[PDB]
């Protein structure tokens, strides 16, 4: 068969819907900008080949073989490493306080932009402004120090009232206007996983890949907008001092594992919920490359518009947002819409398509934790199915009121550097060691050929045993020695947040020896005899 372009339209656009996330649109432009642009792109293309793609391919192979969720994949592999799945459930609780709040900030801009007069265009004493210059060159205003744009003033005081909180040690009350905005999101999420029928259908077209093809028109505006020739040069600076000892590779380790999928246990249920594809080496290789390609375009439109800020402020590109945290997307897109001619209508379009692109990473993102826990109470879910799906939403809601307060960005950064960085990286290390150093690559190599019939490459077989556990161990060894301290919104850091940071990073690390110590005294025999009886797989 030739398999002409009639399949190519149906296939390639369906890969885009499974690739682009908010980790490719929101996380990646900000993680290039935290450690200096250009210095991140070259460690991005090396860590993805050596550490991202072989772990992206490993979880899809074990999903089609054992046909279970990530809680109960390990019972057919090694029964003492069941706490890895419990480490997935305790990390995914921390993501629901980290990732659902960014959705709550996206729907708030949709409500506050029905007016023909956009609030981003001026700082006209509307809610809380002052020391602001809206017209950069439209009313020949020169730029001075300690000045803020109205695109930043609309964020830093309207939606997230930062000045209410003096720091991380003192948080205010609860904002009534934002807490009712996240309530509408969890209503849609609960009314979407109520049945959960999505394997390969045509809902992937409208939900994800059609908002992406309309998001690419922002790059057309950035070409017309000035400062682009001095803007895109900052993204492509290959020379940087000491990319081996500083510790910017954990910014690459956390970004790749948040964008591709492995680490969060979402791939062990996604490859178990479909059928035998028989093209896993040819589908996941295209998907993992285009996931960096759908993130390269979104990592290119942001620094183009930030060159327009650096041009009319007469400052450096790294001088524009020196201490601005994870809200770089809600400032760059805040200015890039107001400079368009159709600023009123396109603000509704560009933000509503950002909502549907984020919900697909949540409607299918909960598949790694809801489907996986179905294999633990088999005789209970016949009268529990209305309860625990509702119970996990309310539990994640009540765990998210620590960051729906006025000091929101003081908690979102803490759940980014410590809850996503080392915690997902450690679980992905134990997932690779226990499948190769303990379960053995000999049994795993015969399991791939049963579903495919094609032998894995000699370049691939050296990765899961020696190469990929070496890079994951070097980053953790470089993290415990180096101070993880950063700076955010003219606030240095408190010293007690660092000790709090390692407590969150070891909150998932403590669950894995807990289940191993649970298997200590419950088995009889000699101490050397109890171990072999514990690591022996089950019998059907």
């Amino acid at each position: 068969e030739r398999e002409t372009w009639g399949k190519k339209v149906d296939f390639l656009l369906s890969v885009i819907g499974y690739a682009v996330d908010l980790g490719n649109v929101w996380r990646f432009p900000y993680i290039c900008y935290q450690n200096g642009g250009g210095a991140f792109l070259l460690p991005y293309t090396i860590m993805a080949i050596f550490g991202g793609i072989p772990l992206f391919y490993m979880e899809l192979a074990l999903g089609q073989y054992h046909r279970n969720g990530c809680i109960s994949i390990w019972r057919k592999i090694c029964p003492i490493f069941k706490g890895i799945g419990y480490a997935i459930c305790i990390i995914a609780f921390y993501i629901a306080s980290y990732y659902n709040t960014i959705m709550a900030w996206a729907l708030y801009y949709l409500i506050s932009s029905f007016t023909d007069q956009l609030p981003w265009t001026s700082c006209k004493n509307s809610w809380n402004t002052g020391n602001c210059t809206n017209y950069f060159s439209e009313d020949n205003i020169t730029w001075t120090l300690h000045s803020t744009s109205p695109a930043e003033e609309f964020y830093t005081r309207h939606v997230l009232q930062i000045h209410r909180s003096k720091g991380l040690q003192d948080l205010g009350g609860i904002s009534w206007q934002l807490a009712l905005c996240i309530m509408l999101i969890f209503t849609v999420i609960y009314f979407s996983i109520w049945k959960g029928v999505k394997t390969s259908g045509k809902v992937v077209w409208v939900t994800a890949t059609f908002p992406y093809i309309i998001l690419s028109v922002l790059l057309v505006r950035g070409a017309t907008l000035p400062g682009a020739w001095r803007g895109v040069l900052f993204y492509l600076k290959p020379n940087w001092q000491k990319l081996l000892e500083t510790g910017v590779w954990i910014d690459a380790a956390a970004q790749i594992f948040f964008s591709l999928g492995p680490g969060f246990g979402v791939l062990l249920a996604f490859a178990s919920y479909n059928k035998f594809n028989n093209n896993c080496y040819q589908d996941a290789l295209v998907t993992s490359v285009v996931n960096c390609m759908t993130s390269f375009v979104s990592g290119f439109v942001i620094f183009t518009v930030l060159g327009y800020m650096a041009e009319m402020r007469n400052e450096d590109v790294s001088e524009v947002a020196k201490d601005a945290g994870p809200s770089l997307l809600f400032i760059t897109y805040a200015e890039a819409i107001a400079n368009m001619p159709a600023s009123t209508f396109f603000a509704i379009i560009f933000f509503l398509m950002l909502i549907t692109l984020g919900l697909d990473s949540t409607f299918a993102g909960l598949e790694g934790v809801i489907t996986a826990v179905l294999d633990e109470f088999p005789h209970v879910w016949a009268k529990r199915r209305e309860r625990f799906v509702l119970a996990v939403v309310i539990t994640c809601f009540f765990g998210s009121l620590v960051t729906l307060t006025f000091g929101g960005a003081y908690v979102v950064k803490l759940l980014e550097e410590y809850a996503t960085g080392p915690a997902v990286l450690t679980v992905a290390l134990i997932e690779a060691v226990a499948v190769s150093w303990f379960y053995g690559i000999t049994q795993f190599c015969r399991d791939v050929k049963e579903m495919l019939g094609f032998s894995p490459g000699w370049f691939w077989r050296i990765c899961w045993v020696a190469i990929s556990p070496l890079f994951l161990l070097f980053i953790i060894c470089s993290f415990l020695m180096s101070p993880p301290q950063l700076r955010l919104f003219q606030y240095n850091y408190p010293y007690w947040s660092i000790i709090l940071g390692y407590c969150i990073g070891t909150s998932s690390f403590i669950c894995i020896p807990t289940y191993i110590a649970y298997r200590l005294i419950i088995t009889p025999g000699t101490f050397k005899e109890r171990i072999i009886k514990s690591i022996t797989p089950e019998t059907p």
Partner: antibody
Framework: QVQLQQSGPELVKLGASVRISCKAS????????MNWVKQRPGKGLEWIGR????????KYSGKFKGKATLTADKSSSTVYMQLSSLTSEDSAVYFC??????????????WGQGTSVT | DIVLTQSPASLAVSLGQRATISCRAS??????????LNWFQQKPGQPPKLLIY???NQGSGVPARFSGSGSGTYFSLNIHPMEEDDTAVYFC?????????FGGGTKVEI
């Protein structure tokens, strides 16, 4: 120290139209609002409207929604208040105050001498 | 058009005593912590002068004889070092939405 002066007193005909000048310099003109305060002799105060320079926005109190007209000019740094449908109650002292620079919205002690019309 | 009434009408002159004036905020709160409220002096014949902005900060050039307090509905005014020169009328203004208005005004005279 921001200089803010006004025009002189003017006479009032029945149902005529007036034009009150409000000159102010030494400050960023298209940065803040401009207040218009009505005060009858003996009575209290009353707010009329506001205007942001650069043809920004005009908000009225409701009593002068079609009776007052505010214009702005970034070149001359002056604003004008065109009144219509004059009566025996409109002849009073009018003020032209500059609003705050931001976070509160107060008056920055930048007031005029009062273009008293009668 | 949120109305506002001042609860006293006129106070006497006695040096070194308490003089407080409250405002009506039956449908009025503050949106961003810094309390949207103003205070103004106005001598007879003189244009109005700022006394206290944001109900807690000292005005520009005004000495420490005047200091405001309160949070929410009823707001205070400390005129405990009462001065003979302060024989004027005082006003109260809202700065929330398009609702800018003034109260009835309270004066002071022996």
């Amino acid at each position: 120290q921001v200089q803010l002066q006004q025009s002189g007193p003017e006479l009032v005909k029945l149902g005529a139209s007036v034009r009150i000048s409000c000159k102010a310099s030494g400050y960023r003109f298209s940065y803040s609002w401009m207040n218009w305060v009505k005060q009858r002799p003996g009575k209290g105060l009353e707010w009329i409207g506001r205007i942001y320079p650069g043809d920004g926005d005009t908000k009225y109190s409701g009593k002068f929604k079609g009776k007052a007209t505010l214009t702005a000019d970034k070149s001359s740094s002056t604003v004008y208040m065109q009144l219509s449908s004059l009566t025996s109650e409109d002849s009073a002292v009018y003020f032209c105050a500059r609003s705050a620079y931001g976070s509160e919205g107060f008056a920055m002690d930048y007031w005029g001498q009062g273009t008293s019309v009668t | 058009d949120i109305v506002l009434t001042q609860s006293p009408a006129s106070l006497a002159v006695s040096l070194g005593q308490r003089a407080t004036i409250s405002c009506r905020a039956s449908e009025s709160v503050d949106n961003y912590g810094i309390s949207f409220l103003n205070w103004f002096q106005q001598k007879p014949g003189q244009p109005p002068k700022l006394l206290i902005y944001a109900a807690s900060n000292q005005g520009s050039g005004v000495p420490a004889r005047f200091s405001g307090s309160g949070s929410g509905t009823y707001f205070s005014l400390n005129i405990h070092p009462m001065e003979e020169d302060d024989t004027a009328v005082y006003f109260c203004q809202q700065t929330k939405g398009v609702s800018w208005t003034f109260g009835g005004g309270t004066k002071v005279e022996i």
